[PDB]
Structure formats: structure tokens, C-alpha cells
């Protein structure tokens, strides 16, 4: 696009991964204001409007909130406390023809300072004196629509930097385009914490025997305790059983009678009691009361 017609395009109901922007190995002035770039893909924001121009690269340091200049005064202005990312990279190899790229025609003069996030489109010329222009260009006409000269013999400061603005505004609307969410594989039949699509909890994920209609997203039983969460990749229905807990009780015949005791781990399977308590962290005197010949359920 052009700088007189950089449209405020609404690209909605999509995703946009930025790790391919991270390992592109061509970025120059990747600047994210407001939020860090390391927490940009996992969490998103609403109003995901975007802009595009190939701006000349010698005053990208002027592109800042609370900083004026030439581009900030006449081409593109940022508001204070910007939430969003401005991205600049080298554009020497592909937008460079012989004799200069005379297609990115740009405005040099405007009567007032630009408001932030305003697309300025015009045809009429700059007014600076008192004598009006009669259509024929004269001594104070001052034609603002000047030319970028982008030759291949320019240096990296004079060669242009391609700008895209992923601005994040705050309006009463949900987000449309966000970054991706990485996901690992699933484990089965284990007391494991999980991160599903919205809900997290502790329990044992087992195979199920019931069925779902295609609109239930999770499940629950009587006294508001959940029983099933949808896994949205494999399309096989899993359940939850809470992994086991309980009290312990110690059976003794008296300290005057003998020194031996019997320990009661209640309502558990009697195979995972070295996995239940930390038998590797406790004493070897405790480690002989987790397994042995006299294991009874």
C-alpha cells in the first residue's frame, strides 16, 4: 500500500503465528510496545487491525510513542502508551528496480500535526503564504506529494524498512486473531494434572463407555463435580476419576507387649503404596512398611 492510502483493514477470525516471524532471519527493528514479545503468542488482545507501508529507514528511531519528527508528524503517528508491535525489516533485495522505485509516492507537507492512527488522503497542495495558487504550480504552491528515491546503490540506512503495525486497541469486542497454542500428547490412567481447552484439574483420565452429542464441551455429575472433558484432537472421549487419598491408621498391640505395628492405608489399591508416599525420601525404617511378603488388601 501507499502512505496516502494505508487502509485500516479488518482481518478477522484467523490465527497468526509469530515464531515464523521470529526465525525469519531478516528483521531489523522488531519493536513491541506495551507487552513483551516473549508473551505475545500465548496471550492475545482484541482489535487486531493491521497496517502496511514500505517506509524509508533513516528515521525509524523517530517512530515511537511520545516522539515527533517527520513520519510521526506527516505520515503515521502513534498514540501514548501504545499496545502493539511495529515491525521493520530489510527491503533491499525485492523492492529495488533501476532508476529508483517511483511507486511509493509520499506526502511531505500537511497544515496541522497528524492525529494518532489517521489515514490521511488528499489531492490539494500545501498552503504556506497569502497568495493563492491558481492551479499552475508557482513560487509558494509547495506540492507535498513527493517521491521516495530508492536506488540499489543506497546504504542500509537509506534503503527502506518495511513497516507493519499490529496495533491492539481496546474496544467492547472479543478478540478475533490470536497466536497459536502449543500442545503435547496425552497420557492415560495416571494421577496427572492436565491443561485442556479452558479447564485444568487433578485426576485420572480413563477410557470412557458413554457417548457425546457434538455440542457438549465438558461434563459434570450430581453435586457439581466434573466427569468428562473433550480432547479436541484425537476424537475419543475420556473421563476423570480423582486420584486416591485417605487417612492412615496404625494398629498396635501395646508398647509393653511388643514393638511391632501394622499400618492401615485405607480405601486404596494395595500396590502403589511406595508410589503414594515418598518411600525414596523417608527413612529405611519406613521403607520396609511399603512392600514385603505380608502385603494384604
Amino acid at each position: 500500500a501507499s502512505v496516502y492510502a494505508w487502509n485500516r483493514k479488518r482481518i478477522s477470525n484467523c490465527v497468526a503465528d509469530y515464531s515464523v516471524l521470529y526465525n525469519s532471519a531478516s528483521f531489523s527493528t522488531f519493536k513491541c510496545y506495551g507487552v513483551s514479545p516473549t508473551k505475545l503468542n500465548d496471550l492475545c488482545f482484541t482489535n487486531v487491525y493491521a497496517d502496511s507501508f514500505v517506509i524509508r529507514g533513516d528515521e525509524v528511531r523517530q517512530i515511537a510513542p511520545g516522539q515527533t519528527g517527520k513520519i510521526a508528524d506527516y505520515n503515521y503517528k502513534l498514540p501514548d502508551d501504545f499496545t502493539g508491535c511495529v515491525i521493520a525489516w530489510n527491503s533491499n533485495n525485492l523492492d529495488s528496480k533501476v532508476g529508483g522505485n517511483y511507486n511509493y509516492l509520499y506526502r511531505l507537507f500537511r497544515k496541522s500535526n497528524l492525529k494518532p492512527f489517521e489515514r490521511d488522503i488528499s489531492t490539494e497542495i500545501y498552503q504556506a503564504g497569502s497568495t493563492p495558487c491558481n492551479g499552475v504550480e508557482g513560487f509558494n504552491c509547495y506540492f507535498p506529494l513527493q517521491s521516495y528515491g530508492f536506488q540499489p546503490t543506497n546504504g542500509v540506512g537509506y534503503q527502506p524498512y518495511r513497516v507493519v503495525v499490529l496495533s491492539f486497541e481496546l474496544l467492547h469486542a472479543p478478540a478475533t486473531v490470536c497466536g497459536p497454542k502449543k500442545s503435547t500428547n496425552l497420557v492415560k490412567n495416571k494421577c496427572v494434572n492436565f491443561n485442556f481447552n479452558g479447564l485444568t484439574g487433578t485426576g485420572v483420565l480413563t477410557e470412557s463407555n458413554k457417548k457425546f452429542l457434538p455440542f457438549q464441551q465438558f461434563g459434570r455429575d450430581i453435586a457439581d463435580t466434573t466427569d468428562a472433558v473433550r480432547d479436541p484432537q484425537t476424537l475419543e472421549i475420556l473421563d476423570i476419576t480423582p486420584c486416591s487419598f485417605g487417612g492412615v491408621s496404625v494398629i498396635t498391640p501395646g508398647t509393653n507387649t511388643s514393638n511391632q505395628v501394622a499400618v492401615l492405608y485405607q480405601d486404596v489399591n494395595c500396590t502403589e503404596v511406595p508410589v503414594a508416599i515418598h518411600a525414596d525420601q523417608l527413612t529405611p525404617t519406613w521403607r520396609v512398611y511399603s512392600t514385603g511378603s505380608n502385603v494384604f488388601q
Epitope: 521470529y22 532471519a25 531489523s28 519493536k31 513491541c32 513483551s36 514479545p37 528511531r61
Partner: nanobody, 124 residues
Framework: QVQLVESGGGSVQAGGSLRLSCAAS????????LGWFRQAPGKEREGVAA????????YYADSVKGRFTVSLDNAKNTVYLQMNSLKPEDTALYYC??????????????????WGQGTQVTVS
Amino acid sequence: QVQLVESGGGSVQAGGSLRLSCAASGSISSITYLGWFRQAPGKEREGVAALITVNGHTYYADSVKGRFTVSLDNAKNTVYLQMNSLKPEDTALYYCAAAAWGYAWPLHQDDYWYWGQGTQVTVS
């Protein structure tokens, strides 16, 4: 929240080697970009080396290209700057800067950096 302590300076004959290091303490995971600065006597402080912590990509200036290299050690949380084939125009004050807003090439003084205390590298 980011504190940088750098060392490894000294004096050496031209054609020798030196190795600078800059240790980072504080919010290590928020640091995204390490840049090495250099201010000659009678000159403005310019940029020499660049390093992205996430990607590992390196950028160098044209006067230090082919002679200077930069590396990162995530175990010690310390960036390294190894100097090979030194010339006596490199006598300057060296600075290490840590960035938490992303990566920006070339290096500029007016942007937000966590600045080091400055070290002296003298060659002749």
C-alpha cells in the same frame, strides 16, 4: 530489574586476542537482546555486536565483520564477546546492554537499555 556487571578488559598488543564477558542478574527470562556498545575518544558511542537470546542470530558492524564474534552462555547467564585480530583503532570504552522489548538493529543510544558500568580496552 536487570543489573549488568562486566569485566575482562585490559591491555594487549595489536594482533592479539581478548575476551569480554557481561554477567546478567535479575529478570533473566525477560531479557531478549544483548548489544555491545563502543565509544571511541572523540567519537559518538556506536554499535558493534548483537545477539538475540531466543533465536541465536548474530549481527555485526562492517568494521568488525570477520574479526569479532559474540556468544551466549545460558548456564552462567553471561554473554561473551571474543576479539580476534585486533587493530589499534579499537581503543575505546566498551559497554554491554540488555534489552527487554525485543531486538533492534542497528544499536542506538536513545532507546531504553540496561547499561553496564563500562570497561576499558586499550590496544596499540
